[PDB]
Structures are given as structure tokens and as C-alpha cells.
Assembly symmetry: D2
Homo-oligomer: 119 residues x 4
Amino acid sequence: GITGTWYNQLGSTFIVTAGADGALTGTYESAVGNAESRYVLTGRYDSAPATDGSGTALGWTVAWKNNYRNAHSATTWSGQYVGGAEARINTQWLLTSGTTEANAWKSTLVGHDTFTKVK
Amino acid sequence: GITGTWYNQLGSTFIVTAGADGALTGTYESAVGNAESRYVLTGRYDSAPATDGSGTALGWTVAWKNNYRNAHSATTWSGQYVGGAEARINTQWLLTSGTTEANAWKSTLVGHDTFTKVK
Amino acid sequence: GITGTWYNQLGSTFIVTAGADGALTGTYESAVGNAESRYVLTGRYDSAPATDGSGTALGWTVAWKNNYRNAHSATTWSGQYVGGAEARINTQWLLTSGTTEANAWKSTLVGHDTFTKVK
Amino acid sequence: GITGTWYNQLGSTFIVTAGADGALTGTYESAVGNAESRYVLTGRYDSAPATDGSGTALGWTVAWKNNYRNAHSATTWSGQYVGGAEARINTQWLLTSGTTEANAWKSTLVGHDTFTKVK
Ligand SMILES: O=C(O)CCCCC[C@@H]1SC[C@@H]2NC(=O)N[C@@H]21
Ligand SMILES: O=C(O)CCCCC[C@@H]1SC[C@@H]2NC(=O)N[C@@H]21
Ligand SMILES: O=C(O)CCCCC[C@@H]1SC[C@@H]2NC(=O)N[C@@H]21
Ligand SMILES: O=C(O)CCCCC[C@@H]1SC[C@@H]2NC(=O)N[C@@H]21
């Protein structure tokens, strides 16, 4: 149930296709920051999750460069998919910017996004 | 410069190929945890980084499932590549395990790996 | 408006007293994990925040040991207080457990809690 | 063993005293960022750690405001103390800045510091 179009609390749009062997591919559009239009994303997910009530672990990356801009940074989202009447993807992310070795201590931002199918 | 074989402080193996369109593909071998043999990885990087002293932002994902074992989890590495005689990849990572809704608060581990390029 | 009794999405109870010079003191009671009853907490906060619409940065620590149990770990919450008709404290935390140097790679959990005054 | 003067890889200074009730108090001096002189710190640690080869869990907070400067932010260090001839404190930290509700997604930086005890 991972395949589809998802939105997070910020209005960003996440469009993924989950492959049978565990691949994630699609595009991401951020509603905030130095970003414009769509960006390519790639990731992986557990294609054979536990039988109990556990969620499905997954993660994907986005390098913020496309035909319009390049913010010289990348974000990785790590979390888990929870199915049901109202499916959700709960994640925590790391946004690393390219920096000089002198500013490397303040290169990574951390946060959390929650995706649902309701625009 | 990113393309090659790398190893982190734990003795883990990272073999990657950086595509011209910003894609990263390869395999990862962890020296620790519930894992064995090689796992597929996919990521993205900044294919047009700043021509200054800044690092190259990148990130990649590994879902801990192959033809031999499944740990129902996924790790994402976010960081930057710093070129030169002694090429290094400094990262911070998030490892999320699939869990029941009740144990969700303790599903994500955080850490940091430093990779050194071989030969 | 920081002083008072707060609750997070897990049902945990946070009781703080903000001192004029920026000190935070109180007790914490977790609704989950190897915890029982109240634990002492101490922290700091910006006692002279910006004039614009910015929140108030703050943070506190809790070592999980009291008269009843000792989980040999500590959590630090870092975030910001947002006042108004419906005040909230948005945070992200790091839970570090004491471990052998061999398991140090999986010693820290990361998450996020949102506190409000509604039990 | 925790009580003393420490320094991290950035050249920052950490002077702390570990109380018998699990309390940590002292001052911190950062070698980088929008800060100058000493800042008050407070934290907690496990005063009854495991008698094995495990580290001692601890954490502390610093709100970046003193009688000379105010950066409207707060950092929390979470980690463990490892005793011996070469005592070390390995940490991971969260630095949260006060921001308007619109810039909240980029309010928290994440990193890691390693402290070495002097003399
Ligand atoms: O501005 C920057 O520093 C980089 C440009 C991209 C910023 C978008 C970030 S990624 C995490 C967060 N989730 C989301 O949906 N948008 C933001
Ligand atoms: O055991 C588990 O919970 C999951 C499988 C093992 C995960 C290994 C982790 S990934 C981050 C870290 N870097 C590395 O090289 N090995 C560890
Ligand atoms: O079980 C453990 O590993 C340690 C015992 C304490 C666990 C409580 C954690 S702290 C972060 C989170 N927020 C909250 O309110 N409760 C949990
Ligand atoms: O500039 C700011 O945004 C805040 C004031 C400077 C903060 C310094 C940070 S705290 C974590 C890190 N460790 C250290 O020793 N110095 C840096």
C-alpha cells in the first residue's frame, strides 16, 4: 500500500512506486526551502515485513538538485509505513548541506515528517 | 571520486558507483548487528557541487533484507564527501526498525560513521 | 508561561518551574519504558527570547534512576516553547543507554515529543 | 571521574562537577558559533552505573545566553562517560534555535562531540 501519492504536515508532495524486490522510486516536491518543482528520489523498503502488527521499515534519499536549482544538500528520510483504514508514513530526517570543514559542525539538520494520503 | 570501495570505523564495507545523473548504487556489508553478506543500496548525491572548499552532499539507504536474512529495518546515511589525497565520507545515520504502534517511540537509533577510501 | 504541568502524546507527565535567570527544574514521569514514578530533571532556557514571533529555546535532561529503578540511561530533550491560546513545547530527544564499547553503535535512540497542557 | 576539565575536538571547554545525587553543574565555553565567554550548564548522570564494562549515561544542557551574548538557542548533549587511564565522554547533541512557526522545520541541528579529560 506504499505506492501512491502522499503529503506531509508541510504540504510537500511525495510520489513513490514500491517495487516487488524492495525498491522505492519517485519524485519529491518540497513546499518549503530553497527548492522548486520536482526532485528525483530513490530508496529501499522491507518487502517481507513481520507477521505481527509491525510497520514496514523504509527510507529514501533526495539530492536537492534539478533543472531549476541546486541547494547543494541532501535529505534522507528513515521511518516506517503503517497500513490500515488511514495509512501513514512516520519518518525522521537528516538534511546535510555541503560545507567547508570549518562549518562541518553545523551542516546537518534533523526533523520529523508524517505523510498521509490526504492532500 | 565517490566511486570505489570504502570502510568505516566498524570494519563495514561500502562499495558504490556514482552515476552522472546523481545516482548512487552498490552494496553494503555490515560488520555488526543482525545482518550477513551483502545488501543492496541506492542513493543520490550532488553531481554539480560548489567549486570551492565545500564537501559534496549525499545520502543512501539500505533495507536490511537480502536472500539470506531480514532484520525488518532500514538505515539511511546522510552526509558529505570530502575529496583530496585522503578522501573521506563523514556521515550521520538513522536506523529505523519495524515496530508495533506501542513500541514506536523506540524504533529509531541514531549514530555517525566515517568512511575511508581504499587505495 | 513555561512553568506548569505538561503532557506529551504518550501520556508522560512533565512538571517544570522556570526560574528568572533561565533555570528549569522539576520532575518527569514516563508512561512507557523501564520507568516508574517520578524522576528529577534539570535544564536551561532562553530567559530573554527574540521580540519577533520566535519561540523560546530550551532543553532539559533526565537520568533514569530514582528510588525504585535504574535503567542506566539518560534522555535530553531539545526544542522550543510556543505561547498563545494553546501553548505547546515541541521537542526532539536523544536517549543514551550505558553500553560496552562494542555495543556503543546502538546506544542512542532519537525521537520527538510534543507537550501541551491538556491531560 | 566525571568531575574535571574536558575539551572536545573543536577546542571547546567543558568544566563540570558531578554531585552525589546525580546532578551535573558547571560551565561551558564554545570554540565556535555565536557565543563568547562561559555559559552555565546543568545536567544529570547515572550515579549508580553497572559494575561491568558499560559506560555511564549522562546528559546536560546549555542555553546560549550569558551576561554578554544571547544566541536564542539551546544545546543538549546526550551520551556516556567511559573511565580508565584515558577517560572519554562520547556524545551526540541537538541544538535548537528559537524560530517563527514557519521556519520551525529547520530549527534543530544535530552532531557529535568527543571529550578528552585534561590531566
Ligand atoms: O532549503 C534547504 O536547506 C534544502 C532544500 C530542501 C528543503 C526541504 C526539507 S527536507 C525535510 C523537510 N521535509 C519537507 O518536506 N521539506 C523539508
Ligand atoms: O541489527 C540491526 O538492528 C540492523 C542490521 C545491522 C545494522 C548495522 C548498522 S547501520 C549503521 C551502522 N553502520 C554500520 O556499518 N553498521 C551499523
Ligand atoms: O526504557 C528505557 O530505555 C529508558 C526508560 C525511560 C524511557 C522513556 C522515554 S524518554 C523519550 C520518550 N518520551 C517519554 O515521555 N517517554 C519516552
Ligand atoms: O551559534 C549558534 O547557533 C549557537 C551558539 C554556538 C553553539 C556551539 C555548538 S554546541 C554543539 C557544538 N559543540 C561545541 O562545542 N560547539 C558546538
